Amino acid sequence: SNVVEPTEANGKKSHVGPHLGSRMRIYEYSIEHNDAFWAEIARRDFYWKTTWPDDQHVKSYNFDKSKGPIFVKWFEGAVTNVCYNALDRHLPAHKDRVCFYFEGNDPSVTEAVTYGSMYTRVVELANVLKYQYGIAKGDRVGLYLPMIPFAAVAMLACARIGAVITVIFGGFSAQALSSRLKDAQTKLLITADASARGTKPIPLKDVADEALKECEEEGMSIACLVAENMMKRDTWYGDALARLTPEQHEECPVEWMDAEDVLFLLYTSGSTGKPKAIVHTTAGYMVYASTTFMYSFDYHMDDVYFCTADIGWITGHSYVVYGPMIHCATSVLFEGVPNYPDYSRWWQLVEKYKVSILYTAPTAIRSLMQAGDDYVKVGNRSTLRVLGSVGEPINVEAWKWLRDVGGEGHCDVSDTWWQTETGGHMITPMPGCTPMKPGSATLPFFGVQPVILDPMKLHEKQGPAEGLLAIRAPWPGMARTIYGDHARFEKTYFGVDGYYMTGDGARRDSDGYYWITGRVDDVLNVSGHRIGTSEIEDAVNTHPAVVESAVVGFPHNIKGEGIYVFLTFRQGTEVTPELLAAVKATVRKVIGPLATPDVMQVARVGLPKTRSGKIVRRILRKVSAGQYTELDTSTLANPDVVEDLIAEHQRLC
Ligand SMILES: CCOP(=O)(O)OC[C@H]1O[C@@H](n2cnc3c(N)ncnc32)[C@H](O)[C@@H]1O
Ligand SMILES: C[As](C)(=O)[O-]
Ligand SMILES: C[As](C)(=O)[O-]
Ligand SMILES: C[As](C)(=O)[O-]
Ligand SMILES: [Cl-]
Ligand SMILES: [Cl-]
Ligand SMILES: [Cl-]
Ligand SMILES: [Cl-]
Ligand SMILES: [Cl-]
Ligand SMILES: [Cl-]
Ligand SMILES: [Cl-]
């Protein structure tokens, strides 16, 4: 009864078919004939300077430590370029087709960027990187940009010449930006003078200057290219253009890449330690991101697509730039926020550009729900037919609101589960063919074999089951390693021979539908952003008066999960609102606003530790959630902390 059937119109329009059988027939084929399946997709849908030698052997891999090093290769011996598949090959047939319907935060700032215009922008920038900054195949380029056309231009210019990009979310502090540039050893930083988020100025160049001063004090010598959106080492993009020759505006050769040449680095939070650079290569990621974009959203050439994610996250890589452009999509590119000038903004964009596919996140949805349906009903949503959710679980009422108010009830919802490490969608509905259970990711994508591993015995559980979500077989979009640390990669994701461990928990029901329960490690999902507890603790501890801290998640009604901080101060410290405010500001300096603690509790007699000195985080998880029952607390070094924490927490309410 908790099932919503797809719309008949989406069934008639589906690339797959009108019935679930149409999807299952394809899926079983993608599993029984994995090589042939991906060989047909890659050959039908992409351009190759050179094709893999044998369609029988389009992949090789090892998911078992005990047999040797973990590895995965797709389309070995193939040669291609991501920029060529995203731009050049669409020309001249789709020269005048709109790539990005761009709007700034200021609604009077708009720009309809065609694929032809993207080409000019990319070759110009690519020639600047080549002949003015000496960017070569393999060189790392950092991006610190807002959601403007230049951000996609920069990712494709680097891809055109073989450069490895690393995108730093424009909301990260200077220290956060500095750390990522150093670890990637970037030759160049591309940024913009500033951006806007409502009425708040986002001066990006000034932050970047603080990051660069820090890198230069550490020995580095990083160049900076600055686009004018609203100066040492620092060159304005206009000055660089003025140095280009007329032919350098027209033409730039494509650097043809091998299947496993690196495409980008993306720093991702983990259960322990600082964020690590996840490494994605060329051929496999290209095929998987574009193929998932096509089927998970049933994109057709007459659709208009709008993803609200930032390029600084994997969602923006795969489903704002790389994926959509490779399938010659017409997309909306929005620099601003959903509540400026008011909360109708996204719906004004939907009718203005006749959007038919909208890809957003539960946190944004729940924010829109707090503002009133009237902010939605003033815009025309008759063109919407597919709605997408990503980043974290979506509750039933939010799912129903999205489809019924947002989509006027004539939409299919694709709640897609996946990760930075998976490259693209892994469990997702497909419009027209997949029955929907509100809150469920439903069925695995073509060529994906998920499993539920028993938490204690680490065996696969048949039929309905709850446990650890794992992937028992490789897929083209899988991350290949961690930058300069394959051992950490093997330990983190392949501790169970034969499986990729996702770090999520999930339940599978009697129809084979998957329900993702959230992280099972020390990783938080705060406002759809992935953040680790260890790095928040390290930031909290940098405050001169903080001795020790412990960070746990706890339930929140908009962000899903909030950040709860237990901390002890230096002796003789007067705890005041200002002090606690200065500690919040310390996290925002070290990391950024996305990691702002929500609650800060003083462990008045200390943090709960075992006799051996290990913090008992389960006790902190239970206290922050108000569960005072499931706590033996006598193995503690100081058992009296429990009543201190329960009391101080109730005093805070
Ligand atoms: C794409 C973002 O990738 P990341 O930023 O690397 O976060 C990845 C992490 O977000 C969570 N997650 C993502 N999608 C969903 C979903 N549909 N339902 C429930 N949880 C989800 C999950 O915990 C995962 O492991
Ligand atoms: C190796 As085959 C032809 O069964 O995909
Ligand atoms: C993706 As089509 C060729 O059916 O518009
Ligand atoms: C929630 As976002 C627009 O920073 O991906
Ligand atoms: Cl059906
Ligand atoms: Cl059928
Ligand atoms: Cl196989
Ligand atoms: Cl080889
Ligand atoms: Cl069930
Ligand atoms: Cl803020
Ligand atoms: Cl102690």
User: By the 8 A CB rule, do 337 and 197 touch?
Assistant: yes
Q: How far does the chain reach from its first CA to its final CA, in angstroms?
A: 38
CA–centroid distance, residue 540 to ligand 2 (Å)? 53
Cα separation, 519 vs 653, whole angstroms: 26
Instruction: Evaluate the omega torsion of the peptide bond into residue 53 and state whether it is cis, within 30 degrees of 0.
Output: no
CA–centroid distance, residue 634 to ligand 6 (Å)? 60
Compute the Cα dihedral for 423, 427, 432, 437 and give only its sign: negative
Helix (H) or strand (E) holding 187: none
State the closest ligand 2 atom to the C-alpha of 32, by its place in the atom list counted from 1: 4
Three-class DSSP category at 427: strand
Q: In CATH terms, is domain 8-81+280-517 a member of 3.40.50.12780?
A: yes
User: By the 8 A CB rule, do 131 and 248 touch?
Assistant: yes
Same topology, domains 8-81+280-517 and 523-652? Answer is: no
Cα→Cα distances 317→97, 202, 235, 320, Å: 21, 22, 26, 6
Ligand showing the shortest atom-to-Cα distance for residue 73? 8
CA–centroid distance, residue 288 to ligand 6 (Å)? 26
Binding site for AMP, by residue number, is 391, 415-416, 419-420, 504, 519, 525, 530
Cα separation, 463 vs 452, whole angstroms: 10
Compute the Cα dihedral for 54, 59, 64, 65 and give only its sign: positive
Cα separation, 44 vs 235, whole angstroms: 43
State whether the beta carbon of 313 lies less than 6 angstroms from ligand 4.
yes
Q: Which two tokens stand for residue 41?
A: 């997709």
Q: Which H, E and C letters describe 595-638, residue by residue?
A: HCCCEEEECCCCCCEECCCCECHHHHHHHHCCCCCCCCCCCECC
The ranges assigned to domains in the chain are: 8-81+280-517, 85-89+115-255, 523-652
Helix (H) or strand (E) holding 62: strand 59-62
User: By the 8 A CB rule, do 56 and 72 touch?
Assistant: no
Longest C-alpha distance within the chain, in Å?
A: 77
State whether the beta carbon of 260 lies less than 6 angstroms from ligand 1.
no
- Measured in whole angstroms, the distance separating CA 525 from the mean position of its chain's CA atoms is 12
Cα separation, 37 vs 19, whole angstroms: 21
Q: Which two tokens stand for residue 89?
A: 């090959």
Contacts (Cβ under 8 Å, ≥6 apart) of 65:
490, 494, 497
Ligand showing the shortest atom-to-Cα distance for residue 3? 5
217-221 long-range CB contacts below 8 Å, 24 or more apart? 218/182, 220/181, 220/182
Cα separation, 3 vs 511, whole angstroms: 11
Query: Which residues neighbour ligand 5 (ion) by CB within 5 Å?
Result: 19-20
Q: Give the closest residue to 261 by CA, choosing from 160, 355, 182.
A: 160
State whether the beta carbon of 36 lies less than 6 angstroms from ligand 2.
yes
State whether the beta carbon of 35 lies less than 6 angstroms from ligand 2.
yes
Resolution in A: 2.5
Residue with tokens 């590895």: 71
CA–centroid distance, residue 652 to ligand 11 (Å)? 23
Amino acid found at 461: K
* CATH code given to domain 85-89+115-255: 3.40.50.980
Contacts (Cβ under 8 Å, ≥6 apart) of 220:
181, 182
Cα three-residue angle 93-47-261, rounded to 5 degrees: 135
User: By the 8 A CB rule, do 272 and 534 touch?
Assistant: yes
Cα separation, 266 vs 280, whole angstroms: 8
Q: Give the closest residue to 595 by CA, choosing from 539, 635, 648, 649.
A: 539
CA–centroid distance, residue 39 to ligand 8 (Å)? 18
Q: What architecture does CATH give domain 523-652?
A: 2-Layer Sandwich (3.30)
Contacts (Cβ under 8 Å, ≥6 apart) of 593:
171
State whether the beta carbon of 291 lies less than 6 angstroms from ligand 4.
no
414-417 long-range CB contacts below 8 Å, 24 or more apart? 414/296, 414/297, 414/386, 414/387, 414/388, 414/389, 415/388, 415/389, 415/390, 415/439, 415/440, 415/441, 415/442, 416/296, 416/388, 416/389, 416/390, 416/441, 417/441, 417/504, 417/514, 417/516
Cα three-residue angle 309-310-311, rounded to 5 degrees: 120
Contacts (Cβ under 8 Å, ≥6 apart) of 531:
269, 523, 524, 563, 591, 594, 595
Q: How was this structure determined?
A: X-ray
Cα three-residue angle 48-482-468, rounded to 5 degrees: 100
Which DSSP string do the residues of 516-566 spell out, in sequence order? EEEESSSEEEETTEEEEHHHHHHHHHTSTTEEEEEEEEEE-SSSBEEEEEE
What backbone phi and psi angles, to 5 degrees, belong to 402?
-55, -50
Three-class DSSP category at 236: strand
Ligand showing the shortest atom-to-Cα distance for residue 23? 6
State whether the beta carbon of 330 lies less than 6 angstroms from ligand 4.
no
Q: Which two tokens stand for residue 599?
A: 């609650």
State the closest ligand 1 atom to the C-alpha of 516, by its place in the atom list counted from 1: 19
